[PDB]
Design a protein around this ligand. Structure first.
Ligand SMILES: N[C@@H](c1ccc(-n2cccn2)cc1)P(=O)(O)O
Ligand SMILES: N[C@@H](c1ccc(-n2cccn2)cc1)P(=O)(O)O
Ligand SMILES: N[C@@H](c1ccc(-n2cccn2)cc1)P(=O)(O)O
Ligand SMILES: [Zn+2]
Ligand SMILES: [Zn+2]
Ligand SMILES: [Zn+2]
Ligand SMILES: [Zn+2]
Ligand SMILES: [Zn+2]
Ligand SMILES: [Zn+2]
Lengths: 510, 518, 519
């Protein structure tokens, strides 16, 4: 629990913001039928033009203000176009001589917006929010969104609007929404607020640098979260880890000044437990690569505080699950947390180490540390006797060359479990794609001396090879593995996505 | 048709072997219930032991010979196990008092062999053929295989057995003799018999593609390759047309023409057509990337790992498409019209080459800013796709060694398929299953499209920011298909067998099964 | 001759060659030390050591035929100076005839037998005294022991290093460039050393001639201009000559050599010079040099850091040494031998017409070759040159080539490597290395690596897939093209260019000549 310091100025906890301005926003959803009132703040119409690419803006909603109605006449609005993410907004006096701002965000030409399209719409809305002092935003939907996409709009809106100022040395108070069939959308609001925080909380852990967020401070943070949500909790220290023979996980942490800490939180429904689930996140608080130092061009060592993104997603999931309280399930939230460093004490390339299931592993590359920690976490997970194990991890840079920065990859040993993940991707709107575990490549992990190799020498499909490795540590339980190495960090916006929180929560809930 | 030469020693045609030793093999299929005769050559039992990991060898089938039956008694076989790939040879005298060779190949303990597993069986089998002058092989199936798997066994046997000596002169292998007879014993032989000549056809289509791929770029250039295609079309009685530069200029194929600018070989666009005799119910265009050498152009393949010495293989897609034309032209399916297309050229460094930054105009009027001259495949394919869609077809399928990134996504065993049409994609996946050429569906992620935006041209050739080049290339290609079901098979990772140092001829069986099942 | 093609009219159409050098105007007189030294005009340098006494004091042992100078050079006066290898001092005084004379010494250290490397340091120090001093004469007094070969080596190196190549200077010629007209040498047993003097002058020019061809840039020295210079040389020496052009190379089916030159604007030219003794021929020898006038790498372009593409005009160093040897042999006229001087000359360029990585080409002996890297072009040209050589029906084939950059990692910049298929011939090369003072080291042809040249499609691979010992692999490749003749291969990739001095060495001329002469 006590965070070691090198100098007295070294931080001993991760700063965490729980009560955010987003939580003070009162949201009201009205049906478009009856007309829209425009009384104050900013009012933005979400507008498309099907077929007509870069077509003119045309507002179809009745507005119950004569000055604003005149502004929104076809002749005026056609001066503007609906190209995706394009916006205009104008200040004017309404019927009461009150200052109001009115504008639109273009939603392009397709009737159904993808999650990527919707993020661009939101980003354009958020730019307006960041540039105007407003007590209120009103958004009018003249496009089609289903319940999940509506909730996604709110989650993204909240997440993108919120600004993380923890390391630096006026938000709207009201949100109105006009949408057709408003009554069906109302229940999405408070769910969105919960999903927003899980995601934002995960983002806070990820964005926190490795001096602040280390294995001791991160496990401490998880205990605090568990205490607030009344989850059972257990942090495993080195002595216990040694007793459990977690040789793969411990070896990765040998070169760190921070002792390894294994996080185990448990949610348990009040009723009968019908499904048991273990969620496992990769928890490397900084990945230097170890003796295989990240020194090659493009290795992005300055990003590597993000290598606990999987742990963050899992803890973000525990927030949502602990808040929403699903029935009939028992959820274990697990992460083998450590730091991968260079030291007289570090493990070396070539070292042979022994995992908790007795398998000996030849280390081919100390920068393939994630799969070693996951190996012992997977053995620990299966001993819990669960129905499903799902891990999520920034595991392989190869993901950038396969699916890229938008879609995460999912691998697994059970087709039914994979389809549940894919369905959860659909309803969470966090995109995932099923990639194969190709058994033909398994032979490349046949070590000359140890039971198995950590990495392949010859096969470049490393996301698949890593999955083959992980599979060796799940013996008879449905397991899926989500590789978020490509999708976790938003490179353009210079911040985490908190990717996976909503995916995992939808998986648990539905 | 005349192949330009720099010196008189430059080859002016690709050597093709049409009648291979495999074609001289007389294949006979017998039902296993009648028992096996062991008379001469080498008789091999394919055995498994379901359950027991490396369980003993048990010879179940009847053997119409007292002497040999005594030999293969469980007592004598107990010492041998069925571990995948294991083989043993036996020597004995039959009731005739003649000496016979017998043996087995282990097929493991799993009761349903995989495509990769069966290949390991065949490879073990080929090892037994390779340094033994035999007149006849007999194979007895004591394992279960469906019709497709049986065909796959034969195809793979034929392909691996065959050795390409077109470019050997001094280095003989003078100990080479092919069996003249193959006997097969299998349960319900009557259903399997039809698979024999189908397998032989598939073998050659695949092996033909292999010959074009392995043929180096001085032998296989755009003129010689299009010449070979003409000769194939003539042998198969297919209609054919080869478009030359003047015609390609008239068609305004500026993306394709630009790639070939730096080559001493004029661009040649291959167009073969197979048409069924009856009602035509489906029209299909098969498009193959046909870069006969890919130097990279001014974006020269000089970086570590760029494998410039492999780049004669960059017309693998074209080879696949021509191999498919062999099978389709031989099998003659009904109700169908197939167009076999390749925009053939060579990507070279010259005073005449196109340059990074050049803006060029495709045949559909779209201007393209060339960001990297080594992304040349998608440019040639753009113009080929436009041409294909003008034929007014139901399906366009292209196949290409398009992106090295495939090695990082699916690797060397599975090709990737991308597309704009789920039904077409499903048909290709079904064709993958029945051809036993593995393919995996990968997504066209529209979010990356904005990164192909050009400040000056209509579209950029490559992405500024996205590293998922297999997807970006797919997004680029999709811009050249307006309203037709289309799929794209990226075979960059699977085309070359790096371990065996030879091409696979990947895609011939996949495309043929697609054509046939439709 | 052939016409050199030009892209523009300002493209040079011949290599500038200086035949009558200032070194050739130098009159050399050798005296026996026992007669005493006359000390008059110019600069008189004593070569002095002190055996065992590291940095020991200078002592002038020779009789000096002048009272003033003898007094000046007496032990007490000289003890303030020391013999540290390479150090030197200038003296000024008036002699017995009241004329001012310049005197000095170069220190030759404390080890009695000077290595070839030590002697070069002594010579360089001496040359430093000749530069920037307008002298009419230099006199050198040997107070160190040198055998006949080492004495000749001194003279050769002096001549070579003193000479300054200004062929490509225009606005920057040295205004003060002025050479001695006389060289005096005092040495014990002078009559035994006299025969080495003109031999040294001939060896110097062969080496300097090779140097001129190598230093000449690839626009000046291309396959047409280089073969033209070989013709001119042959005419001046009365050697027989034949230059094979493309049509003749095609007829001989030299596909490996032709493929390399496909991408060049300059047609391939195969040089074949022949010296025949007037006597009865007892030995026949072919000397083959790699003649790549520029090596860009071809499609395997030299773009990697350290590939030194700007040095690649030097890739005809082997051809240059063979031609330099032709000069020496044609001048000294050895008896009872017939020597063939051979080079498959071409240029390795990037073009629409270039051969490609992966191409399969057929050598003149029928062997098909899979090209794995267009930058391993030397061994391809040498393949056909070796087949051509063996058909001449000679007793020995020796090739010399800047073949593998790996040499720098094995033997470095001072020692060349020799490989071969015949021990007797290798020892004769090593023996010639001793007498020429151009150091060579015997390296193995490791047959275990041969399998790594097995091609899946062609008869043989040009390069290894797995073996990094490229100097050895290259030698294995070359051996496949000599069937039944004693053959040796000298890789001078590391030693040809003097990186410190920024000039070629003309390495191999003296080595090869000694080889021809000793036989
Ligand atoms: N932390 C993993 C990782 C994750 C992402 C990236 N990466 C993401 C973008 C570019 N590189 C590299 C390594 P690892 O080094 O494979 O353990
Ligand atoms: N020809 C394509 C290609 C295909 C394969 C490979 N490649 C396959 C294995 C290793 N590299 C590289 C480039 P391109 O250079 O992307 O056009
Ligand atoms: N020309 C040969 C060569 C010779 C010398 C060097 N080299 C000499 C010093 C440093 N590099 C490199 C290549 P090649 O490219 O191996 O044919
Ligand atoms: Zn790592
Ligand atoms: Zn990591
Ligand atoms: Zn390319
Ligand atoms: Zn290509
Ligand atoms: Zn070279
Ligand atoms: Zn060279």
């Amino acid at each position: 629990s006590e965070v070691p310091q090198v100098v007295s100025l070294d931080p001993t906890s991760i700063p965490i913001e729980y009560n955010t301005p987003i939580h003070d926003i009162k949201v009201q959803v009205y049906d478009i039928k009856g007309g829209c009132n425009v009384e104050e703040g900013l009012t933005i119409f979400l507008v498309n033009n099907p077929g007509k690419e870069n077509g003119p803006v045309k507002i179809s909603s009745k507005v119950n203000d004569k000055q604003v109605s005149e502004f929104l006449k076809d002749e005026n609005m056609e001066k503007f176009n609906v190209k995706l993410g394009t916006s205009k907004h104008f200040y004017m006096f309404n019927d009461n001589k009150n200052s109001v701002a009115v504008g639109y965000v273009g939603c392009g030409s397709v009737a159904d917006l993808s999650e990527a399209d919707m993020k661009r719409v939101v980003l354009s809305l958020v730019t307006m929010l960041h540039d105007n002092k407003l007590s209120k935003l009103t958004v009018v939907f003249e496009i089609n969104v289903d319940k999940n996409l509506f909730r996604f709009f709110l989650e993204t809106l909240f997440y993108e609007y919120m600004t993380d100022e923890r390391f630096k040395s006026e938000y709207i108070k009201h949100l109105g929404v006009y949408i057709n069939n408003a009554d069906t959308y109302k229940e999405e609001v408070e769910k969105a607020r919960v999903y927003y925080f899980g995601t934002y909380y995960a983002s806070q852990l990820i964005a926190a640098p490795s001096n602040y967020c280390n294995p001791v401070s991160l496990s401490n943070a998880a205990v605090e979260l568990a205490q607030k949500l009344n989850l059972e909790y257990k942090i495993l220290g080195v002595k216990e880890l040694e007793e459990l023979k977690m040789g793969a996980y411990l070896s990765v942490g040998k070169g760190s000044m921070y002792p390894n800490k294994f996080i185990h939180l448990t949610y348990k429904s009040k009723g009968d437990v019908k499904k048991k689930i273990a969620l496992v996140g990769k928890g490397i608080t900084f990945d230097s690569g170890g003796y295989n130092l990240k020194a090659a061009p493009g290795s992005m060592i300055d990003l590597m505080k993000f290598d606990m993104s999987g742990c963050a997603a899992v803890l973000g999931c525990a927030y949502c699950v602990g808040t929403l309280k699903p029935e009939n399930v028992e959820i274990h939230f697990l992460s083998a947390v450590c730091e991968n460093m260079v030291s007289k004490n570090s493990y070396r390339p070539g070292d042979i180490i022994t995992a908790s299931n007795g398998k000996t592993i030849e280390v081919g590359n100390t920068d393939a540390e994630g799969r070693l920690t996951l190996a012992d976490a997977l053995v620990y997970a299966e001993k819990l006797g669960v129905d499903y194990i799902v891990d999520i991890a920034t595991l392989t840079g190869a993901m950038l060359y396969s699916l890229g920065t938008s879609y995460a990859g999912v691998f697994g040993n059970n087709e039914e479990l994979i389809n549940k993940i894919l369905q959860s991707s659909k309803t969470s709107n966090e995109p995932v794609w099923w990639l194969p575990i190709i058994n033909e490549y398994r032979a490349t992990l046949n070590s000359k001396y140890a039971d198995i190799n950590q990495i392949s020498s010859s096969v470049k499909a490393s996301s698949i090879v890593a999955s083959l490795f992980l599979k060796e540590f799940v013996q008879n339980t449905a397991w899926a593995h989500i590789d978020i190495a490509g999708v976790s960090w938003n490179f353009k916006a210079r911040k985490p996505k908190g990717f996976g929180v909503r995916l995992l929560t939808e998986f648990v809930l539905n």
